[PDB]
Amino acid sequence: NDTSEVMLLDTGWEFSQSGTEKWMPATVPGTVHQDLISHELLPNPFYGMNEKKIQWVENEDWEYRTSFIVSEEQLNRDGIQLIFEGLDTYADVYLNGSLLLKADNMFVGYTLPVKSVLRKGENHLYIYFHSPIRQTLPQYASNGFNYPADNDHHEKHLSVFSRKAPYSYGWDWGIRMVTSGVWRPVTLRFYDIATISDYYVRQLSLTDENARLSNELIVNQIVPQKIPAEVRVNVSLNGTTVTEVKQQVTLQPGINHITLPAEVTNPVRWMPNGWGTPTLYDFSAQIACGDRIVAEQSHRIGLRTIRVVNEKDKDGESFYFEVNGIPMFAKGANYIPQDALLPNVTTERYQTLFRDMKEANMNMVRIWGGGTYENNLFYDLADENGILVWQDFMFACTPYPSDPTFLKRVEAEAVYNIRRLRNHASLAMWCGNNEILEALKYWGFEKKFTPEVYQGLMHGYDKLFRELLPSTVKEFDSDRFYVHSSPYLANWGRPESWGTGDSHNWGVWYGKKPFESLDTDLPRFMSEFGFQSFPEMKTIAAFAAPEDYQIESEVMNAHQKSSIGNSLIRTYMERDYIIPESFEDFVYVGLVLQGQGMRHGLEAHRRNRPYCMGTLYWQLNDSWPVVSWSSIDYYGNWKALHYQAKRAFAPVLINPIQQNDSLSVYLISDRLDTMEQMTLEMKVVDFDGKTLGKKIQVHSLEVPANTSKCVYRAKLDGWLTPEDCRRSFLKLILKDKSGHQVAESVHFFRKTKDLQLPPTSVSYQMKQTDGKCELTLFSSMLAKDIFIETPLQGARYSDNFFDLLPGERKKVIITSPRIKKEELPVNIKHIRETYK
Numbered sequence: 001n002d003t004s005e006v007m008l009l010d011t012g013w014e015f016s017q018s019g020t021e022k023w024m025p026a027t028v029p030g031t032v033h034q035d036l037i038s039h040e041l042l043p044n045p046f047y048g049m050n051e052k053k054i055q056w057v058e059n060e061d062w063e064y065r066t067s068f069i070v071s072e073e074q075l076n077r078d079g080i081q082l083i084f085e086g087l088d089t090y091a092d093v094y095l096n097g098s099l100l101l102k103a104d105n106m107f108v109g110y111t112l113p114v115k116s117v118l119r120k121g122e123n124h125l126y127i128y129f130h131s132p133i134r135q136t137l138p139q140y141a142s143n144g145f146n147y148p149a150d151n152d153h154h155e156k157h158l159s160v161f162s163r164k165a166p167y168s169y170g171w172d173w174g175i176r177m178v179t180s181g182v183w184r185p186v187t188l189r190f191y192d193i194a195t196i197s198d199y200y201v202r203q204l205s206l207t208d209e210n211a212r213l214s215n216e217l218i219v220n221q222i223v224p225q226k227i228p229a230e231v232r233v234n235v236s237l238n239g240t241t242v243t244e245v246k247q248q249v250t251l252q253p254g255i256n257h258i259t260l261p262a263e264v265t266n267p268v269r270w271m272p273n274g275w276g277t278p279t280l281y282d283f284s285a286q287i288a289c290g291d292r293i294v295a296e297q298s299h300r301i302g303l304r305t306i307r308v309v310n311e312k313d314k315d316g317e318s319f320y321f322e323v324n325g326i327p328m329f330a331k332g333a334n335y336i337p338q339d340a341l342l343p344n345v346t347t348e349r350y351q352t353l354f355r356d357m358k359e360a361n362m363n364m365v366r367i368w369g370g371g372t373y374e375n376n377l378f379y380d381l382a383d384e385n386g387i388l389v390w391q392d393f394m395f396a397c398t399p400y401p402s403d404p405t406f407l408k409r410v411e412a413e414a415v416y417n418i419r420r421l422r423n424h425a426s427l428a429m430w431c432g433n434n435e436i437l438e439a440l441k442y443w444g445f446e447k448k449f450t451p452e453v454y455q456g457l458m459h460g461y462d463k464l465f466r467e468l469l470p471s472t473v474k475e476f477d478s479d480r481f482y483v484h485s486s487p488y489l490a491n492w493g494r495p496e497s498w499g500t501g502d503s504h505n506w507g508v509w510y511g512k513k514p515f516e517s518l519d520t521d522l523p524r525f526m527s528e529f530g531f532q533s534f535p536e537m538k539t540i541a542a543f544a545a546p547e548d549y550q551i552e553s554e555v556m557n558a559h560q561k562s563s564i565g566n567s568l569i570r571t572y573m574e575r576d577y578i579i580p581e582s583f584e585d586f587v588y589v590g591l592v593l594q595g596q597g598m599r600h601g602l603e604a605h606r607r608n609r610p611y612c613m614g615t616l617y618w619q620l621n622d623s624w625p626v627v628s629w630s631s632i633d634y635y636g637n638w639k640a641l642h643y644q645a646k647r648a649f650a651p652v653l654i655n656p657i658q659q660n661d662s663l664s665v666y667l668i669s670d671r672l673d674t675m676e677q678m679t680l681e682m683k684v685v686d687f688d689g690k691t692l693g694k695k696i697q698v699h700s701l702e703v704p705a706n707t708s709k710c711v712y713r714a715k716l717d718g719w720l721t722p723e724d725c726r727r728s729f730l731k732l733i734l735k736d737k738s739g740h741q742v743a744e745s746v747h748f749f750r751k752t753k754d755l756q757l758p759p760t761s762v763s764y765q766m767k768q769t770d771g772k773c774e775l776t777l778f779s780s781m782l783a784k785d786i787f788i789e790t791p792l793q794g795a796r797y798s799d800n801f802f803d804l805l806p807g808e809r810k811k812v813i814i815t816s817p818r819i820k821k822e823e824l825p826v827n828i829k830h831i832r833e834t835y836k
């Protein structure tokens, strides 16, 4: 890289509750709450009813200190810069008697010149964190109304006054832990001549023949003299130079703007997951002053075009992604913070979450606007997994202030994070907020405030989301799409709006609509829809003692943040399943339910391309142990929904859909190549494994690239009696001309509660090696929605939550670093076992 030296300020930190003068070791990056936990000064916040027990923290102020040594040689470098990648939130930063900074925005990184303030020998850094509650109580007192941020779990809704992660105040799947601290790294850089403050690789054009780039650098030179320099940009792939360009300059004191064009002939394109390789070039910019490289900065760069097509059409207004010139059906989910305490999220946890997205056939993730702008690692992993990123700005579900001071704060954060993120191949679009305009129009605020205050909120909306944010995107990321809000117009109660742009269809769940409604209530793009489940028993055991395994234990209830939820789960369960008498069986069936219902929607959305061009379910993941809409619980365990999403998002899918006592079969493909001379084969099998009638064959089928087409239709009457529909299933298989199987599905003709499932034992043989367990499962009769349950937290399965078919063996590999060459406890559940 270059001649600079970096000192990480990540050890030797102490913290103190202000006014106590009592100090203890801290971990940085970190949080006040974690530091307290680490010294048993707080109980496990996620356990039982500990939520109320930890709230006192947000009322105190907190101080952090560290000491470090600087040598005479270090102090003689031309420049010395202290960088805070993140301070949560109101932080007075002192070094050696100087107030360097009064921080006030969790989402902004600060770079501070400190050479003239540093001393040879010991140097003392000291940070005072004002309570974000006590900082904002006087601001609320001045305001004369309470903003309607119902997810802020306090009588006074103070969240809206602070540029701090909205979810930290609470959410409808989240614990309240209003934390503070040095939440991202602190670095001291000792350098000569200059630093590169920003490097932007701006793609000017891209064809199969040529990529044209403009390398835009901002160089901050710290010395008083004029300094001859050569700027060099090297473009490489897998360690081999593809192109190199240079420019002679003379760097002036202060900011210098340097622009070097570069071209890449016959570029290797970045493709999204499912369509090819997510190829990334390495672009390195260096400043050379004579022999020495005084500054260097690199980015991984993907060469691709992303256009968001949002245009008036015959159906209303389209909303879809075109990637490298091809309409790409979006398949993915909404991402929330992985933890209540952000610095606790490790590299390994980020890697695993991406492995979970990639393995479920996803190509998109929405970074929802009540969390954070994610760390750099998150976007790097999106780049290398070919996952497009929809980035909200951090505003959600409430109007916000719009006074000049506040807007200037927000402007700083928008500029910072835009420049931080704009080089990522995965970055697809920006969205001003989550649900704010929908809130303003439909959530009844006009009965909560004076007409004057309401008008003020409406004008304040425009100032921020229709003016400041789009203008900032236009200036700093001019070829990326921005939309002011998600959903921008469509509302779930208003079918007339559903052909316009993206939908959050909360008809299912909030409107109590059955999952079958998802076949009829179609959006142009589904940016949210969802259904809750209790996480599995090992996760419940992590927050509850066995006496508090009920639905409505006090316990229990502390881990259900919606209000609404437990009763809705039982209501929906009764529609399709027998409600089990035991809590453990209810948990298992609720997982099955969430997975089955949701996959029915995912299937409808893809089936109804091109009217519908994407589906992002609510929600991928959890921030703590809780009952929620997630497909993956806090401990990384896949719920049934994650396996079902994987199946529903398979590049080629056979989709049987039965409505009005009739069956249709669609073939759905997101491949880039067309498949020709295909055969769909079907057969009706009873629960004892006996074929009813004969095989049905449909030959000569084509499955064009990026299409959903019906290839088969039949009435049930005259084919199967009501009795057969209760006692049999349909096997569907698709094969190429040579008879190689490319897809398979199973279809049931009745609701699970209406099936005549036989009593059955699932037997298994277990071959255990290191970190691995191979089970071979057998049942002579159908075992419905089987759940292979192990007590090992985070264990991975090759499959789970599937129907084990009569007399058809099935191999499942379980993996975990904790499986020893044995021995693994296995409990196999299936539907019939849940009642008598």
Ligand SMILES: OC[C@H]1CN[C@@H](O)[C@@H](O)[C@@H]1O
Pocket (backbone or CB within 6 Å): 171, 172, 173, 370, 396, 397, 434, 435, 528, 618, 629
């Ligand atoms: O209520 C579930 C979710 C609905 N919409 C999302 O944008 C989130 O605010 C909620 O947690």
Ligand SMILES: [Br-]
Pocket (backbone or CB within 6 Å): 078, 079, 080, 081, 113, 114, 115, 116, 222
């Ligand atoms: Br300096």
Ligand SMILES: [Br-]
Pocket (backbone or CB within 6 Å): 081, 111, 112, 113
């Ligand atoms: Br600086």
Ligand SMILES: [Br-]
Pocket (backbone or CB within 6 Å): 255, 256, 257, 258
């Ligand atoms: Br300049």
Ligand SMILES: [Br-]
Pocket (backbone or CB within 6 Å): 144, 145, 448, 449, 450, 453
């Ligand atoms: Br009011």
Ligand SMILES: [Br-]
Pocket (backbone or CB within 6 Å): 465, 466, 467, 470, 483, 484
């Ligand atoms: Br706009």
Ligand SMILES: [Br-]
Pocket (backbone or CB within 6 Å): 656, 657, 658, 659
């Ligand atoms: Br169906």
Ligand SMILES: [Br-]
Pocket (backbone or CB within 6 Å): 658, 659, 660, 661, 662
């Ligand atoms: Br039907």
Ligand SMILES: [Cl-]
Pocket (backbone or CB within 6 Å): 043, 044, 047, 050
């Ligand atoms: Cl505890």
Ligand SMILES: [Cl-]
Pocket (backbone or CB within 6 Å): 085, 184, 185, 375, 376
């Ligand atoms: Cl980070």
